[PDB]
Write a protein that binds this DNA or RNA. Structure first.
Ligand SMILES: [Mg+2]
Ligand SMILES: [Mg+2]
Ligand SMILES: [Zn+2]
Lengths: 34, 1236, 96, 55, 100, 347
RNA sequence: UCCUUGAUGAUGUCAUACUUAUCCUGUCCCUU
RNA sequence: AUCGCUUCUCGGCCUUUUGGCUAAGAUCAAGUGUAGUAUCUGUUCUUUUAAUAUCGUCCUCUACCGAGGACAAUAUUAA
């Protein structure tokens, strides 16, 4: 059951930027200790 | 476009900085002049569209139709088009919600979303195309419809506002010419009188409409809410890719209602030019307004020098009549304000260089000063902040005692009128380019009008053809030709008779026609060298041609007028049009398109004639019929057939549609040549069936056209019911949704495949392409050149070794014909060689396709043809006889099969590369492309009438040739109802009773269903036991095969495999039956079984399968209670035997018994209850359990036959309301036996 | 089947997408917000999300210049709006 | 001999010049073999001059 | 919101993403061939391999495009440098490169 | 043949061609070897498997495309670019005769015929207003029931007064796709509705609109009665609107005349044909190409335009009271009581 | 000094659920 | 105060960082169904008949060898 109600957090753009910084889809892992 | 928007942001900024240009004294003058005009005409202002307006849904339907016409040509749509069509369909499906929405936007909305701009490139100038939001566009379109309807009711626009509904632009020029002629003493120059013709424009009329003053004038006209909407709508943001500005000064041309604003602002400036007095004299009184070029009195005509005045959208045309006093006074004023001491007015004066030297305007000082002075006086009447009039864009022409001509140019063509009283010296009338325009009072021709096409319209047509040659869908050959035909008929049906008087336009037509033909040829690559056949272009699109129209003197060669046919006698060569003539010259369009003067004379005639016809047809009380209407179908100014438009009652509310279609150029990106007309109101206005008909007659007739094609390769008996099928090609969803226009660089000739296949016996000729002429792969096809899609077609037609299999199927069939005629001729045994299989596609040599082994000797004859008669002679050549079988693929140059046969005989028997066992054999040549066959060789007695009948049989029954023909029809997508396999239809019924074994097969009662109601009430469908009815019409033996319900476990919805189970059971029955009782013919009642049985009897190749037009009542035989109880009570499939001729053949002929049985079964099918009563009237009459029908003497059989005959005939006459006492015997036969 | 009412989530994704892609790539921003087109994203930006749009209360000299320009340029809110420094919709609404 | 020594030096073993100076591929060629074995107007023009002389 | 974060994170195109995966695959096949060669040298099997390239082996063999240091006014023929300590029981691939 | 157990049942895998004949369906590239010693001996990969009788079979059973299967594959990416001469599209086509992936042609064909075709048919069948055991099926607009066809009344506000339908029991999609027994039973209903409407003083127009034969709509045969002073003008309106119909510069010579020949032997089995009939005398026919510039209604637009009816009636309909207003069938039944031929039990 | 060789079977397989170089689309619902 | 080590704050280096051009290069859209691949869960091997295909001897041909034919059971699957 889905409820329509005005929230409290009210997600913003800088929250999207901060949660987008931690995705890390371009940081290759370092080579293993050989 | 980027430079234009830089300059346009500059202009809007300079307007917001430099204030109004309008100089408010001048704006008060404009406003006050408009107020005095509107109170002079007693104008009633347009209200807000009312809440219960009775005409509102009509105008809404009209506006939605005009918005839907924009996205009709294309089929690629983005999101904005999808939203726009969704809103149009919602406004159809709920009109009152849409009208509430429109009226709510008209009351409230005043800020609007941004509009887009792009430019249509017309190659000489650019046209703005505006992109408005869909909701706004619907509201604007309804507003435009309402404004034009209320403006035409209230008579807002006087008749000089020229794009009016009941006037084509050539009718406008014609009315202008006869209005000049019908002015009082207009050509007299005796006391000193001048005529002046000024033609100019309002240079930046659109660009300079101040929106505040526009609000003021619209609040004079319409309600203040409507005027505020129309003013605030013009002030939007214009976007292009980066660029955003605000239209603060000009107007937006692309708004749906901008046409109304333009024509009304032009009315205001017409009041500025003419003055209120002369404009009121032209409009007449409001209680009795006059039409366009007519005054109230002769005295009101000559009151002022301005005589005639029209305004096309931003083009001005005034006519002036001056006495010498007024002329000298106005020249004095011009020379006062602008003196000329060096006589330099004759230098900068432009004259028309189209006309010859005697025909142009002379340069006299008085006439040049008068033209410049009249231009000066009209130029001073307009403030440069409102609009201006420039000398470099205008043309003035003065008719005087020194000038015998006045030149003018009103619509897209120019014309000069010359009176007979002035210098003509030869009163002639022969040219169709002229107009003999008569004076009204005297009913005598005073002047001639000479018509040429303007150079700008010629350059417009040339740029139109240049656009056709661009636009990357220009490699489709029907896209090109249809765009060419549309542009050509737009040009001709606009400029009808002015085209032949203009020689440069005719040369331009020939040049552009050769250019688009060269584009098609380069699309086939064709070569630079000529003798490409013009039959592929001008052939109507129904015969597979392009349907290309023509306006140039092109001729077809005499070598194209050759054709042929192979009948039972042999090959017959027919020829078109040979006595000595070369007059085969492509029927070009000017003869078949009526000139405008004939239109204008004929139209009043046919409308008065139709009025009298429907007046006498309503007093005689009959509704109008298609014949008397067909007398005058394609004739009239609005074209009499327009009275039968789908909706005439809603087109009575569509006003102002000329200017609306002329301003669709700023809304729609597509340019149409019919910007001046529309078929909804004006009619079709051209008809080309005579043109198409004698195009077919000029190319050589239908027979002479189709010999250029692979029509003979398709092997249809006739050409009549052939329908083409562009709905199943590769242009499909994958092609439509293919994204990436570089796809259309390799796959660009794949639309052209069918065309290239169809005309392939002329494109792939030696005399069209000088070429290396390689042989195609496993074929006897030689490809001349590298035609882009022909090889794909010929590989897909001859897929999986079709030449080899056709060859070894004709060899085997001809051997099998020789395998049964041993004891008629002199034989021992026929034998088939096993040569290398690479001999079918070997043109240089061949070896031996059969070898005969004659008993003693054969005095054969001599080499002759297959279609020769006589002359048996020389030496005997024991034991040896060879035939060869050559398969060729002929073209138009070389498909004479007899000449080919004798040529290959004389080339193969007289060399060392091909070695034959004997010198006494024959080769048989077959042209697969034309289905021709012949032979040439040594014919021994009793062989030629065998080979004639044998080849005639094999050329229509070979299963390999069937695969060839069906693959050709497959690749050509060409279909046919009216010819089929020849049925049993009427005349073949006598052949039912021969010595052969013939079957009737009826599967009508196989898949029978019973419907019953469930607990839901919803009706469901359950099967019952069915049967297959097989009947002998020559013995009477019956095969009843009961089809049980169990098989139907597996679909039980629509079935569709029933036909297949029936064909499978018939094939299994013939398989179990011995070879003595196998049928020769199987004739089926239902045509749908003709294809499955022919599949399942491929193991039995000797069975002919025929359909019946003559239907038989064999379904009624299972209505009998014995058969019904045998079927419905059964639980196992079984074959039951019967005989419906019960004991009749002891005393009756098979056909009499069959006719009696058809009478009985048809009476059971219709009479029922009454047939059973009449056939069983007495208890003492009995029937035997080994039989079906009662034992009767022959007279009793005659009695019951006459009775059931009356049962059939009376019920036919009852169900068709016809008398049975007037029927002829053939009609009675067609009622009883089959169906007429 | 595009548009409707704008929620806070779509507007914050629109703000972050203008921060990433700029004010000259609206079809890359409208690919990030379904049921909203590029014209709708551009209009929503310039009409409620540009930080030059004065969402504060109208002062006295602003509404005086508003009445002067609206008497001075009748129903020309796209022309009046850059002079008094408000959105044309806000300008029209406050004039009414 | 000159023309098929030019063929055999370019390692184009999948082509065949017959004795009447027709150049035909022995097999069906890949995209790389077809891009490799495309001759110009010099080779083909000399081949056709030799075809005329052999006629 | 998930697509919003995943598209605000990305900056790389097709070729950069295939080259990063190709670098990881090259590292994996290098460690695999290293393990195979280390086993073949540990048990002791002297299978030699091939090389088919014009350049590339010129790096360890000698000084690639060697320029001699220009000589003058001071004798420098006597002095020399001391080679690096091998120490192949502590030394790692990370150690030669230095910390990231 | 194949089974395809569609969630419980068994459906026999069958394929339809363009001509609507229903056929039972039986159940890296390596560039195979298209040559011999120096000589070209076969093009496709299976040129030596097909016998002549097998070619006759595949020509009779085969659907009418044979170009599209190759054109779809070579229309794709990485196919190279046609550089004018020496590599045309003709020899690009030859180079794509590779080795199919172990009866992959068979699997794809089977998959298309079975799963796609069956799904489309089922979807049409379940949402069909006709074909009795369906989902919507108002069931009280039924007036008649025959051997294989019946009379129905439309689901919407019914453009004219006695608007009725002649509908078969099964999906058949066309009249040319019908067999003669179903067509002769439709003509009996036609000859009865003409005689009923003529005795009321009205006239008859029988429409049949068949769009593209790949969407599987049910066959319906319209009957729209309108007054005799309007029905005498009815051939003129259709003669005018059929020639000013579908795309200009057509191929097939618009306005086929069916007065003597009739529909079955006038339009071939397989292609769309809007057709019109005026009472008992046949009217006109029009083979439909360009399925976007031809409305799917087209006949009620002309009839509702000559009767001056609003456009909501013909496009999208107006729904009625689901039992109350749809008891016009009571009025239609007392009209059709003397003219019923589908029974004799009237004792 | 736990023993301490010249070497032709081992971990699988099947089913279900989640995402394509295939598959088919040019397409619609529902109340006043 | 001076020198050294360790917290803490901050300034300057931080272009060490956005590595071209064209018509903002262009355009802007989806749903369903099947097939294939991967992952997870559950449970199995080693130590008579039917269908299809084809070393010894004898004969003939050609220069001990080769080819051709005939003859003698063999292999697979299921109960
Ligand atoms: Mg990309
Ligand atoms: Mg390229
Ligand atoms: Zn149905």
């Amino acid at each position: 059951v889905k409820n329509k109600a005005p929230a409290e957090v009210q997600i913003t753009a800088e929250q999207l930027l901060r949660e987008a910084k931690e995705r890390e889809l371009e940081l290759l892992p370092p080579p293993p200790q050989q | 476009t980027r430079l234009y928007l830089k300059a346009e942001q500059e202009r809007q900024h300079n307007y917001l900085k430099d204030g109004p240009y309008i100089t408010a004294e001048e704006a008060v003058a404009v406003y006050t002049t408009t107020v005095h005009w509107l109170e002079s005409r007693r104008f009633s202002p347009i209200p807000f569209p009312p809440l219960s307006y009775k005409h509102d849904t009509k105008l809404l339907i009209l506006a939605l139709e005009r918005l839907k016409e924009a996205y009709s040509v294309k089929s690629r749509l983005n999101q904005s088009q999808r939203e726009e069509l969704g809103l149009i369909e919602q406004a159809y499906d709920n009109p009152h919600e849409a009208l509430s929405r429109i009226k709510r936007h008209l009351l409230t909305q005043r800020a609007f979303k941004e509009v887009g701009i792009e430019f249509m490139d017309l190659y000489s100038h650019l046209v703005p195309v505006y992109d408005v939001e869909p909701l706004e566009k619907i509201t604007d379109a309804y507003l435009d419809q309402y404004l034009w309807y209320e403006a035409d009711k209230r008579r807002l626009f006087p008749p000089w506002i020229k794009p009016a509904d009941t006037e084509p632009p050539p009718l406008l020029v014609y009315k202008w010419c006869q209005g000049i002629n019908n002015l009082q003493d207009v050509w007299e120059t005796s006391e000193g009188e001048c005529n002046v013709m000024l033609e100019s424009r309002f240079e930046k009329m659109y660009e300079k409409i101040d929106l505040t003053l526009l609000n003021r004038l619209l609040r004079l006209i319409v309600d203040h809410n409507i005027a505020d909407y129309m003013t605030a709508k013009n002030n939007v943001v214009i976007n292009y890719k980066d660029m955003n500005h605000t239209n603060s000064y000009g107007i937006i041309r692309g708004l749906q209602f901008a046409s109304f604003i333009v024509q009304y602002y032009g009315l205001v400036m017409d009041l500025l030019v003419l003055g209120l007095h002369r404009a009121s004299e032209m409009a007449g009184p409001p209680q009795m307004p006059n039409d366009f070029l007519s005054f109230q009195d002769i005295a009101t005509e000559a009151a002022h020098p301005i005589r005639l005045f029209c305004r096309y959208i931003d083009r001005i045309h005034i006519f002036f009549r001056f006495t010498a006093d007024e002329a000298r006074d106005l020249i004095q004023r011009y020379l006062t304000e602008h003196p000329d001491p060096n006589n330099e007015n004759i230098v900068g004066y432009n004259n028309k260089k189209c006309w010859p030297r005697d025909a142009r305007m002379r340069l006299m000082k008085h006439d040049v000063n008068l033209g410049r002075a009249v231009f000066w006086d009209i130029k001073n009447r307009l403030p440069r902040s409102v609009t201006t009039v420039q000398w470099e864009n205008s043309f003035v022409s003065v008719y005087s005692k020194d000038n015998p001509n006045l030149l003018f140019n009103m619509c897209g063509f120019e014309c000069r009128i010359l009176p007979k009283c002035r210098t003509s010296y030869e009163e002639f009338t022969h040219k169709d380019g002229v107009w003999n325009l008569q004076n009204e009072v005297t009913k005598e021709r005073t002047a001639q009008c000479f018509l040429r096409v303007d150079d700008e319209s010629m350059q417009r047509f040339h740029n139109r053809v240049r656009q056709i040659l661009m636009a990357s869908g220009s490699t489709t050959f029907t896209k090109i030709v249809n765009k060419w035909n549309t542009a050509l008929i737009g040009l001709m049906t606009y400029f009808r008779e002015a085209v032949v008087n203009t020689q440069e336009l005719l040369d331009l037509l020939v040049k552009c026609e050769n250019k688009i033909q060269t584009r098609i040829k380069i699309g086939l690559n064709s070569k630079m060298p000529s003798r490409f056949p013009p039959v592929v272009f001008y052939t109507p699109k129904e015969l597979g041609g392009l349907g290309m129209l023509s306006m140039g003197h092109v001729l077809i060669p005499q070598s194209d007028l050759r054709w042929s046919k192979q009948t039972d006698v042999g090959i017959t060569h027919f020829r078109s049009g040979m006595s000595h003539e070369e007059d085969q010259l492509i029927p070009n369009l000017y003869r078949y398109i009526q000139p405008w003067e004939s239109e204008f004379i004929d139209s009043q005639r046919v409308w008065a004639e139709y009025a009298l016809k429907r007046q006498e047809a309503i007093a005689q009380n009959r509704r109008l019929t298609l014949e008397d209407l067909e007398d005058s179908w394609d004739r009239g100014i609005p074209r009499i057939n327009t009275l039968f438009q789908k909706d005439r009652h809603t087109l009575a509310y569509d006003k102002g549609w000329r200017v609306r279609t002329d301003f669709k150029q700023y809304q729609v990106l597509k340019q149409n040549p019919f910007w001046w007309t529309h078929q909804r109101h004006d009619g079709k206005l051209w008809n080309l069936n005579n043109y198409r008909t004698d195009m077919i007659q000029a190319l050589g007739g239908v027979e002479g056209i189709l010999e250029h094609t692979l029509f003979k390769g398709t092997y249809f008996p006739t050409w009549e019911g052939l329908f083409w099928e562009k709905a199943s090609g590769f242009e499909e969803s994958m092609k439509w949704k293919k994204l990436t226009n570089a796809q259309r660089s390799g796959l660009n000739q794949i639309p052209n495949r069918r065309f290239t296949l169809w005309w392939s016996p002329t494109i792939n000729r030696a005399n069209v392409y000088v070429g290396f002429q390689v042989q195609l792969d496993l074929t006897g096809i030689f490809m001349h050149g590298k035609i882009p899609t022909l090889k794909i077609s010929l590989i897909q037609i001859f897929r999986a070794h079709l030449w080899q299999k056709i060859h070894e199927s004709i060899v085997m069939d001809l051997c099998q014909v020789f395998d049964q005629e041993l004891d008629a001729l002199e034989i021992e045994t026929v034998q088939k060689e096993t040569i290398h299989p690479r001999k079918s596609y070997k043109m240089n040599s061949s070896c031996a396709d059969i070898l005969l082994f004659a008993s003693y000797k054969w005095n054969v004859s001599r080499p002759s043809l297959l279609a020769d008669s006589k002359d048996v002679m020389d030496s005997t050549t024991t034991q040896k006889y060879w035939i060869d079988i050559q398969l060729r693929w002929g073209d138009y140059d070389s498909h004479d099969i007899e000449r080919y046969a004798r040529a290959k005989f004389l080339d193969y028997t007289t060399d060392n590369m091909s070695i034959y066992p004997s010198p006494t054999g024959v080769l048989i040549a077959i042209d697969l492309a034309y289905n021709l066959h012949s032979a040439y060789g040594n014919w021994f007695p009793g062989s030629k009438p065998l080979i004639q009948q044998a080849m005639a049989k094999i050329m229509k029954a070979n299963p390999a040739l069937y695969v060839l023909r069906e693959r050709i029809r497959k690749g050509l997508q060409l279909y046919s109802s009216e010819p089929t396999e020849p049925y049993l239809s009427s005349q073949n019924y006598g052949e039912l009773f021969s010595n052969q074994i013939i079957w009737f097969v009826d599967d009508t009662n196989v898949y029978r269903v019973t419907i019953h109601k469930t607990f839901e009430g919803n009706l469901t469908t359950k099967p019952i036991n069915g049967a297959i009815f097989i009947f002998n019409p020559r013995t009477g033996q019956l095969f009843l095969k009961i089809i049980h319900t169990s098989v139907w476990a597996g679909q039980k919805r629509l079935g569709q495999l029933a036909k297949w189970k029936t064909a499978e059971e018939v094939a299994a029955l013939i398989r179990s039956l011995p070879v003595e009782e196998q049928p020769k013919q199987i004739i089926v009642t239902r045509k749908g079984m003709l294809d499955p049985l022919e599949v399942h009897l491929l193991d039995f190749p000797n069975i002919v399968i025929k359909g019946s037009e003559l239907q038989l009542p064999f379904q009624a035989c299972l209505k009998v209670e014995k058969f019904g109880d045998l079927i419905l009570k059964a639980t196992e499939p079984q074959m039951v035997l019967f005989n419906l001729y019960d004991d009749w053949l002891k005393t009756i002929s098979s056909y009499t018994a069959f006719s009696r049985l058809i009478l009985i079964l048809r009476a059971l099918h219709v009479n029922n209850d009454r047939a059973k009563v009449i056939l069983k009237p007495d208890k003492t009459t009995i029937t035997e359990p080994h039989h079906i029908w009662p034992t009767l003497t022959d007279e009793e059989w005659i009695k019951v036959e006459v009775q059931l005959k009356d049962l059939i005939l009376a019920d036919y006459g009852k169900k068709n309301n016809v008398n049975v006492a007037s029927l002829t015997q053939s009609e009675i036969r067609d009622i009883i036996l089959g169906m007429e | 089947i595009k548009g409707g009412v704008w929620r806070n989530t779509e507007d914050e994704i629109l703000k972050a997408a203008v921060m990433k892609y700029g004010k000259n790539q609206w079809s890359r921003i409208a690919s990030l917000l379904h049921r909203k087109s590029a014209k709708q994203c551009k209009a929503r930006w310039y009409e409620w999300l540009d930080p030059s749009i004065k969402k504060t209360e109208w002062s006295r000299e602003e509404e005086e210049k508003l009445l002067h320009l609206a008497k001075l340029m009748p129903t020309q809110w796209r022309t009046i709006a850059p002079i008094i420094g408000r959105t044309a919709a806000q300008c029209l609404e406050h004039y009414e | 001999n000159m023309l098929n020594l030019l063929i055999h030096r370019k390692n184009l073993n999948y082509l065949h010049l017959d004795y009447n100076f027709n150049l035909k591929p022995v097999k069906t060629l890949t995209t790389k073999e077809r891009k490799k074995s495309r001759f110009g107007n010099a080779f083909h023009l000399c081949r056709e001059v030799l075809r005329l002389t052999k006629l | 919101l998930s697509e919003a974060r995943a598209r605000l994170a990305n900056t790389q195109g097709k070729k950069a993403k295939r080259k990063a995966r190709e670098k990881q695959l090259e590292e994996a096949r290098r460690l695999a061939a290293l393990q195979k060669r280390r086993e073949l040298r540990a048990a002791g099997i002297e299978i030699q391999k091939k090389r088919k390239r014009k350049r590339g082996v010129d790096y360890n063999a000698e000084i690639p495009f060697e320029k001699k240091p220009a000589l003058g006014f001071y004798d420098t023929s006597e002095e020399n440098y001391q080679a690096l300590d091998a120490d192949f029981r502590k030394l790692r691939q990370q150690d030669l490169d230095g910390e990231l | 043949s194949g089974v395809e157990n569609e969630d419980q049942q068994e459906v026999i895998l069958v394929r339809t061609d363009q001509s609507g004949r229903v056929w039972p369906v039986n159940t890296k590239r390596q560039m195979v070897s298209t040559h011999e010693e120096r000589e070209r001996v076969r093009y496709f990969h299976d040129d030596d498997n097909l016998s002549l009788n097998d070619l006759v079979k595949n020509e009779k059973m085969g659907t009418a495309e044979n170009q599209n299967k190759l054109f779809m594959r070579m229309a794709s990416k990485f196919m190279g670019k046609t550089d004018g001469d020496y590599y045309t599209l003709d020899d690009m086509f030859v180079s794509k005769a590779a080795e199919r992936e172990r009866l992959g042609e068979e699997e794809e064909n089977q998959r298309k015929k079975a799963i796609a075709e069956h799904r489309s048919l089922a979807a049409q069948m379940e949402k069909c207003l006709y074909c009795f055991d369906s989902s919507q099926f108002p069931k009280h607009l039924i007036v008649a029931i025959g051997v294989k066809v019946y009379l129905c009344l439309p689901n919407v506000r019914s453009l004219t007064e006695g608007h009725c339908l002649i509908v078969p029991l099964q999906h058949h999609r066309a009249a040319t796709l019908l067999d003669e027994d179903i067509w002769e039973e439709i003509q009996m209903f036609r000859k009865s509705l003409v005689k009923m409407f003529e005795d009321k003083g009205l006239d008859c127009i029988f429409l049949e609109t068949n769009m593209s034969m790949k969407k599987q709509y049910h066959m319906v045969y319209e009957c729209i009665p309108l007054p005799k002073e309007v029905g005498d003008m009815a051939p003129i309106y259709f003669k005018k609107a059929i020639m000013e119909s579908d795309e200009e510069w057509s191929m097939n010579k618009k306005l086929i005349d069916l007065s003597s020949k009739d529909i079955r032997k006038s339009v071939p089995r397989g292609l769309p044909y809007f057709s019109v009939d005026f009472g008992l005398h046949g009217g006109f026919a029009h083979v439909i190409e360009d399925q976007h510039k031809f409305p799917h209604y087209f006949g009620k637009e002309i009839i509702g335009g000559m009767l001056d009816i609003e456009p909501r009636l013909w496009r999208k309909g107006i729904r009625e009271s689901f039992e109350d207003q749809r008891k016009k069938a009571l009025q239609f039944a007392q009209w059709w009581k003397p003219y019923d031929f589908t029974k004799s039990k009237n004792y």
